[PDB]
Design a protein around this ligand. Structure first.
Ligand SMILES: [Mg+2]
Length: 271
């Protein structure tokens, strides 16, 4: 039909390998998925149907008003602002649109929870929701201690619904743990909520999310996430298929992270 349905999307997910009980991190382009009856909310319903009440869904929500670049690497932050930057509120603050409209609807799903790192904020729904979303500290955006580390430890799977291979966020965790030199770092500041005296701008120091090494940080050229995912795809371990009208991928998170660490060691462990 012109519009896929909750049930037809659930069938496509199952055919791609999603199973009841799974922990799924989703990156979607809902335009690639195409019209579904009831819109993006019905895509969440289908995913929930696919993983059952025991499964957990997860998404990279971030924040539509994050001051990442405005505070990046000791930038003179322009107090022209006079600090009326909107506070990061877990329930009301918007998601970063670049990571997909679906994260807004995961947030609206029943009993969904959201992590407190404003720039790296994660949404999760299901038994593992609090486990995944707490703790989430400045300086632990995507690496050790982050929700990504626990997503990998709990056997998560990465679902791309028409999103490109560079959107595989769990490979930022592989970047963080890979025993190689010359890894790039950044610094920025975020409005925290500390000892309930409102906003306290606090500082983070973390690995660079836009290029872990110099050669991966060039514009117009593949970053490490894309480079590694493409190389991993050649093994034929992942699953591919259509969901709705979107070319889609399902990856085992432990395996692609382990591949990514191996890849980075074999290629950049020399310097
Ligand atoms: Mg369990």
């Amino acid at each position: 039909q012109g519009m896929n349905t909750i049930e037809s999307i659930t069938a496509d997910l199952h055919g791609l390998g999603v199973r009841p009980g799974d922990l799924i991190m989703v990156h979607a382009s809902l335009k690639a998925v195409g019209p579904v009856e009831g819109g993006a909310a019905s895509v969440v319903s289908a995913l929930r149907a696919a993983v059952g009440s025991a499964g957990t869904l997860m998404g990279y929500a971030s924040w539509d008003r994050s001051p990442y670049e405005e505070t990046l690497n000791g930038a003179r932050m322009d107090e022209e602002l006079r600090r009326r930057w909107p506070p990061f509120d877990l329930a009301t603050s918007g998601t970063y649109p670049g990571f997909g409209l679906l994260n807004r609807f995961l947030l609206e799903a029943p009993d969904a929870r959201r992590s407190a790192h404003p720039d790296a904020s994660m949404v999760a729904v299901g038994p593992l929701a609090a486990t995944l979303t707490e703790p989430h500290r400045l300086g632990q955006a995507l690496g050790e201690g982050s929700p990504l580390e626990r997503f990998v430890g709990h056997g998560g799977k990465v679902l791309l619904l028409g999103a490109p291979l560079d959107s595989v966020t769990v490979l930022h965790y592989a970047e963080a743990i890979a025993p190689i030199p010359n890894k790039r770092r950044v610094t920025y500041e975020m409005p925290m909520l500390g000892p309930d005296g409102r906003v306290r701008w606090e500082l983070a120091e973390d690995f660079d999310s836009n290029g872990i090494l110099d050669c991966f940080a060039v514009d117009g050229k593949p970053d490490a996430v894309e480079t590694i995912a493409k190389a991993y795809v050649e093994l034929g371990r992942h699953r591919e298929g259509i969901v709705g009208r979107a070319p889609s991928y399902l990856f085992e998170a432990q395996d692609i992270v382990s591949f990514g660490v191996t890849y980075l060691e074999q290629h950049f462990g020399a310097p």
